């Protein structure tokens, strides 16, 4: 019969380890789980056990992924064809896995021998530990749980390592597959789809397992990328073919983005940031997380307070939108409560009569009832030595006393008192003990300071607001405002077309390109001004998500878009040219070698010239170079009304060749008849079904065609092969059958048939292209290369062009005109594009703390954004294997990344660091990610903790500020990574909040003077960091906030770097 | 899961009709039987009936043939993979049929529309009847019984017809396949092995059926070989592939071959049978009426020396009253005129009567009788300068011998063809596969007859001018002489030897083709050659090293490794891998840096071909010169073409069909390589032409390195020897005919007449004159005659009756108009059966007019005006030698024919009388009678009949017999 496996991933279920095989947030059945169940079925059929049956899997193809639900059961049916040696796995009648499985009759232990490494004896003392290996895997989208974490150790290149054996054949072989992708330079999720051959011999597997000092038996895994073979224990995976799996948008966390900006106390309104500011002020001035609010304000206040993670809201603070009513409201409100009244001298008099003190004015009236307090304690937190923390502990150590303690920062305007107070407010000492500050942050020296011991601070006590900051005359405090949802745009002459969300044509926008921040115009490349950029089928396959971006050959990062393979326009000299590019051709400008450039003749329009390069190069390479079309031959050209088909028709008819075309429309028949008069009514067939084969065979006298230009697939491809004549040439221009490894029956080759896999894409990564270029040029001179039909969409209608030519109704080529041709001469451009952060290759960028968790990922992101001169500052240098691997990759791929021990906490250290950066090139960016943690309750806090926690962040940022101001006139980025702890408050880390707030003040001062400045209030970071590596596993709720993923973190950083705001925040709600 | 189908061929079993699907004497399960079984399994799985389940079969592959035993049951297990749409038929765990089966979701009745014929049928009235269709099929080896005889009618071209419907799908689709293979130029037993797609829609099948006047449901069948499709009713077979299954050597037709040579040792009734009016038949009947006085019946033939009453006495003895009559003959068969006539009125007659011998015939002073002697089993060997190597029995290297070539009995002379004496002929892998039977003769392209031997693909020797040349031929290279076009000849260089040069033409042509013309190898390209120790591998190594290419070679032994290292010193230790394993792939991928190799010249198979494909680099070229994976249609993963990889199916044998400038490119490449020294001949192990069998078995095992060369003639020391005549060597005699001579077949439109005509065409006859009183009537005759005419033979269908002397003279003149009369075959026969009691002198006259008088006139006219006559063959019957019930006249005519032939041979003229037994598969016993015992003898099959006739035509005996005992 059929063996049925009810896959239950329940707690008491004997297959519960499968819940730990999470990929992109979905529990997927492992590719090796199918092998295990097929092995079990074969053992049952043969009467043996799995451990007693060596097994061989051949041509294993995984047709779909099985999603294991949280609750329920998935039934997988394994059917064996013993005579055919084949198997199949079905979920609900749908084919899941197919291939050949059979008993290994003569098992060879010599097969499971580790092949010699291509670069043996690396002499590398640093390796990738298990934690680092799975951190790197998680960064790529592999959320493997503890049961599938079997790589205890691996080399930095992923070519060798150690595999933990846990009496499991699914987990061990899945870790074997993990090792095969650990060393891959590809980015993103890669799932196994085809494996050429898997050999499992448990007999030699048992003898290859050796126990460690832990007493857990392990094996040694080796990945030979040259041989395409993975061996570990008694398993030999050969020919594994992983295919990119798109990362689902559901797993993409949506973060809350806010800007930290100073808000004066004294400044339609319901739907304005003033209401949010008042609500946040009330939340800040509160004993605990309980929010007792009594009231059309029910539709805004709960929504505005919802982003706050720890706020417990009880909506029925007093909000309303006369003397007796005010008295009743005051009586209802408790001591220290806030009354928020919205209405269109009399109001102030009524508030005074009701003993209400106004603390906010938005022109929304904010009133707070004074609370009886004794003489306050004045503690200056402006001491550089942090000697004030001892007095802070002394006053806050008396739990019995409720006397207010007013902190003051009258000096050192860059004082981080805000974050310190934010963290103290939720600490058990100081929740109601009034740990209130007062900061005089003068952004300009012209504005005079507020003298102490005067009426201004008396008004401060009168208001009794927890946060009181004097910023350029006005009195207020810093507060969080929701960031604008719109992506910032700038007028740029260099832009490109990108799909912001993969697979969505409506997401197509023009984005700032990397050809403006860096323009390294040198021989071998040319910054060509694109006038017309045509679309190809690959562009839609990319923009609709049907084709993975990495399937395009060439070194492409995970951020850049690859839309457009061809353009026409101008040159640096101004000559009218048309060029062929591997990608990025759908842009305002393209950097391209002159080898892939032609000269547009005088008669040709620039618009019509924009359809020739891709289509005619493809046709020439397929027909002349590869197909070797002799004159007078017979050709079957599929999709002859398309681009490549039309050029092949023109080329063949230039040689006087009999042509058979397949078109799916009578309109396309008419168009081809009109375009090429030499075609006969018998020359046209149907491209939407197989009957073209019967048409060709009948009209060729059963002989067939000498050439086939096949873009069709499946049964149409098989019929096209059947159309071949003796000595016939088959040119495969399509990719579906090739990508799916569909079986081509090897009996057509008995007709002296040559099968061509024609891909005009290796010309951009390997020379021989000059032959095709010369052929295209010669066809241009002879008139053979004729411009195609061009449907024109302007630059602003790129989405319209994409969704038009996706319908398939277009005839010829669809052209996106970027810049209109000027009729003034044939020898003699601003556009609002989304701001994307890009960096010149000639500038140096410093990441203090760049060897840490966020530091390494930010460095990699900067590399992908064009940074070629990088300086990473660490207090200890390279210690971990992960850091060594990342720095090694960056150095190998061409970047001048330099590790420096110089500490920014010292001014001389910062000067030396800036000098080291300037040695490579001008300092274009400074990133302060240096951090240490002395987290603990205030009673355990010591001044030395404040010194050593503020030196990495506060004094380091001050030194970076000074040195950049005095030696970096060309600096473009000054980014410090603060924390949401500073923004709102995290009990147990007060000095951390102080350092972060001081960095925020430094950045605000920098931005006020017109210098670059940016402070990012980061929430918990998920993939890497300090809290994740130490303790936090996966995504646990931390202080009401989910740990943000690195992909979202880098996207948010890209967004933040293109905003005029001084300080912005980012976190993900639980 | 597995649906069990116990196939029982017992009479009570529902599957008893399967006994009628006999092929080559074996009851085979039809391919359509597998189709119906899988269809039933799919219907059961979907809970439907077959008639309610339109079905599609795809990529049906038949891996083995199921033999249905006479006693017992064969169980076929069918397992369905619905998810993958695949099925599998297994018998005792062995895979039989695999493919894709699924329900036709959208049945299109427009699919079952008969395609238009490429040309209109001119002979619409002249079609092939059911009897003719299955007579032809049985001749090809298809012994279809009544249940599988569903082709009611068929056109001569075999592209259309009608199929009878018996509510049986297996029979209907089998007849569809039969109609598909009916119009096939290929001869032999062809069985389906692969079908691309089969669409069965019973819904439109019911509509397509129609009822004739016989109340029998029929369906029109159309076969389109241009579209490679066959449509009939609601069945659509596309891409049917049939491979010629060799006919089993366990042929029960082991004829008893005998000679007929003269063997010296109441009231008497004398009846003179010498009268030419046969008026004595009534007297013989009156004599046989009596009982007592009829004991001494002494019928004497005195006047005519070729009276032939021997058959009269033999057949009349079997009649009731023959032994009682004791019929005794006095035949004065004086072979020479100078011999004295034995007087029948003297003491000689008294002595003959006293002897009482059953048969007494006088022959030049000897009183004897005609007796049957067993024919010598030794094949006649003759000294000829034109002989070829052939396997007498396929698959047996022991049965390898030299047979007289077609050039000996037919010397051709025409521009564009050269007759070159062969000094050294080289064995090739295809030759070994042909001799061992692993390769069918039909796999080699060309127009090859059934008896044609295709051993030998390459040779070296001297042309007609005496120049030293080595050439390449499609086949027949293992001969003492080769007739080939000059475009396939290379001049042997002075420093080369004929033995040395006899290794280049195939090996280096193939290597140069595959590498340069197909592979387009460029200098410096990493290149992988499989089996580099063999010929083609060695040539590819030589070419690649001449181009300075890095070479990876796979060899099966360390000795071959050492030989390649010594021969090509440019190969390092890292250039060699293992060909008997997959490890060459790992070796190549490691030593190439994982990139691959730019070219792969692969002759390996199965996993060793997939590994080689995996060895390919980006822009790699795969040159597939092997055939196993090509012939088996093994799947090839198409993801390799994502590496810009070109896959070449390289077959050098395609150059012998067109011989255009495409071959001239390879010829120029080989000549240039010869003149630059790139083409260097391989090591040759030489076996003398006397012993070719040991060469075949030596190279079959595979220890040989380089080439195995058979030396036909030792190269004499000279440059251009004027003579160049092949040495006279003894070879098995084979009947061949000049192309310039005309051959007459009296009664050549009959069954045996048509078979002999086809055999003569296969033996080189180009001018045929078939005679028939009524001309062409049957569609089989028209099809055969038009096929011969289209082949190029001048076939003349004359109505000149050989009964009259004037008619024979006109027939001979008609033949001489085409060309000199090289041979006359007398097969004209009319039959007037019945016992002697119900017999008439007119019946004797009618029966003897075609045979007795026909041979009279043929002998006379050939003597007068046929100096170049080589054959005078008449077909007698065993009924003459022994006797048949109620066939006295037939025996008399046959014996007269035999006497005529004996006299002709005695006078030195050609003459042959064949006493045929029951003739099978065609003729009179096939139409009138029904593998049925006739007079204790089985009907001899026509393949055996033609083989025995070939044996007889090369014998010195006047009369021989052939029959098969039951």
Author numbering:
A (entry chain F): 858 to 1124, 1217 to 1244, 1251 to 1271, 1312 to 1316, 1325 to 1347, 1375 to 1393, 1400 to 1802, 1805 to 1866, ...
B (entry chain E): 858 to 1122, 1410 to 2074, 2077 to 2112
The authors write:
Fatty acid synthase (FASN) catalyzes the de novo synthesis of palmitate, a 16-carbon chain fatty acid that is the primary precursor of lipid metabolism and an important intracellular signaling molecule. In humans, the FASN gene encodes a 273 kDa polypeptide that comprises the catalytic domains necessary for palmitate synthesis, which further homodimerizes into a pseudo-symmetric complex. The contact point of the condensing and modifying regions is the neck region, a flexible linker composed of two short unstructured loops which allow for continuous swinging and swiveling motions of the two regions relative to each other, maximizing ACP accessibility to all catalytic centers. hFASN is a validated anti-cancer target and is over-expressed in solid tumors including those from breast, prostate, liver, and lung tissues.
Denifanstat (TVB-2640) blocks consumption of NADPH by the KR domain in both protein preparations. We found that the drug binds the same pocket and interacts predominantly with catalytic residues from the KR domain and the nicotinamide of NADPH. However, the binding conformation of Denifanstat is different from triazolone and piperazine compounds, with the Denifanstat being more solvent exposed and interacting with residues from the dynamic loop predicted to be involved in ACP binding. Finally, we solved the structure of this region bound to an anti-cancer drug, Denifanstat (i.e., TVB-2640), demonstrating the utility of our approach as a platform for structure guided design of future hFASN small molecule inhibitors.
